[PDB]
């Protein structure tokens, strides 16, 4: 059904905007990409860059992943990212999120042929 590469795109890529335009961005996008369906996904990051430029991070600085595998790569440049974190008063099905827009380096894990991002590891 959905490959790891397409799930990465649905949960983490937002090429349509260059930044969140309002504090309401996370409540709208978490729901539109189905991250509120059987639970409220607690934290999620969206990258506001073109697919090609995020795909290119797979040949940049190789680092270890939080899980200890070494197929993770760190972007040389900072990227526009929007950080979404569930509020303390949030309870499924009424998922509420705080938005934080920033320019940060990302660390993604890559896999397959073509070798593409499949897991968002962290932003730094
Ligand atoms: C559809 N349903 C299950 N598995 C599929 C589908 N299309 C491709 N696959 C394969 O299993 C992985 C699904 O993504 P993850 O949830 O494991 O990250 C794909 O990478 C593909 O190998």
- Given in angstroms, what resolution was this structure solved at? 2.1
Per the annotation, binding residues are 7, 10, 41-45, 66, 85
Q: Ligand 1 centroid vs 106 CA: distance in angstroms?
A: 23
Residue ranges at the known binding site for substrate: 7, 10, 41-45, 66, 85
Which residue's alpha carbon is nearest to atom 3 within ligand 1?
1
Evaluate whether 82 touches 48 at the Cβ level (below 8 Å): yes
> What are the DSSP E strand ranges found in 1-124?
43-47, 61-63, 72-74, 79-86, 97-104, 106-111, 116-123
| CATH 3.40.50.800 applies to domain 1-124 | no
CA 98 to chain centre: 15
Torsion of CA 71, 76, 81, 86, to 10 degrees: 50
Query: Which residue's alpha carbon is nearest to atom 13 within ligand 1?
Result: 3
User: Tokens for 48?
Assistant: 């506001």
Residue 12 catalytic?
yes
Pairing of strands 72-74, 106-111: antiparallel
Listed residue (58, 75, 37) closest to 113, CA to CA: 58
How far is Cα of residue 13 from the mean position of the Cα atoms in its chain?
6
């Amino acid at each position: 059904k959905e490959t790891a590469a397409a799930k990465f795109e649905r949960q983490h890529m937002d090429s349509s905007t260059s930044a969140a335009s309002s504090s309401n961005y996370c409540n709208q996008m978490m729901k539109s990409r189905n991250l509120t369906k059987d639970r409220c996904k607690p934290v999620n990051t969206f990258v506001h860059e073109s697919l090609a430029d995020v795909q290119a991070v797979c040949s940049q600085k190789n680092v270890a992943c939080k899980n200890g595998q070494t197929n993770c790569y760190q972007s040389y440049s900072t990227m526009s990212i929007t950080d979404c974190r569930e509020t303390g008063s949030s309870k499924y099905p009424n998922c509420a999120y705080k938005t934080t827009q920033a320019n940060k380096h990302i660390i993604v894990a890559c896999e397959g042929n073509p070798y593409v991002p499949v897991h968002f590891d962290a932003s730094v």
